[PDB]
Ligand binder design. Structure first.
Ligand SMILES: CCNc1ccc(C)nn1
Length: 164
């Protein structure tokens, strides 16, 4: 059936205070069907809080919207994020001693543009320790990676988390 609603949402920060439900929707409907679109407002003044959210029908639509950044909405470049600890680096554990840089590259390059691959080695012996760090040029790669239940790299079932 339908992917969980939480995984179909984009929070949108940095809105122009003149953006409305209607103008935010007209913008983001370019990349898919929107089931919901709200600008957050003060309950008493109705003045914009400067952020909102949109909900797409599918995760592929969320991907399309993030691939179309930067978004200029009503004259202002906004900041869309998936459902925040916003980082560009992941820890990859469980890769043992036989996983190479090209294994990590070939797998993770389909999530985002890779800038650094660091396979960790023992400070004394030089032996591989069984984990690595991958740095991307942008946070959405990481956000897509860490919501997956599973990552299989070089036949290993890997543990992947955000790295600070
Ligand atoms: C040690 C390998 N480092 C990297 C960095 C970036 C890319 C794309 N591939 N490999």
């Amino acid at each position: 059936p339908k992917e969980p609603e939480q995984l179909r949402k984009l929070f949108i920060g940095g809105l122009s205070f003149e953006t409305t439900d209607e103008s935010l929707r007209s913008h983001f409907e370019q990349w898919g069907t929107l089931t919901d679109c709200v600008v957050m407002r003060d309950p008493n003044t109705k003045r914009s809080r400067g952020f909102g959210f949109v909900t797409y029908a599918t995760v592929e639509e969320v991907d399309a919207a993030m691939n179309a950044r930067p978004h200029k909405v009503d004259g202002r470049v906004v900041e869309p994020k998936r459902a925040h600890l916003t980082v560009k680096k992941i820890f990859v554990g469980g890769i043992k001693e036989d996983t190479e840089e090209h294994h990590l590259r070939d797998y993770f390059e389909q999530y985002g543009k890779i800038e650094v691959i660091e396979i960790m080695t023992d400070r004394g012996s030089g032996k591989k320790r069984g984990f690595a760090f991958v740095t991307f040029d942008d946070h959405d790669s990481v956000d897509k990676i860490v919501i997956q239940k599973y990552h299989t790299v070089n036949g290993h079932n890997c543990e992947v988390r955000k790295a600070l």
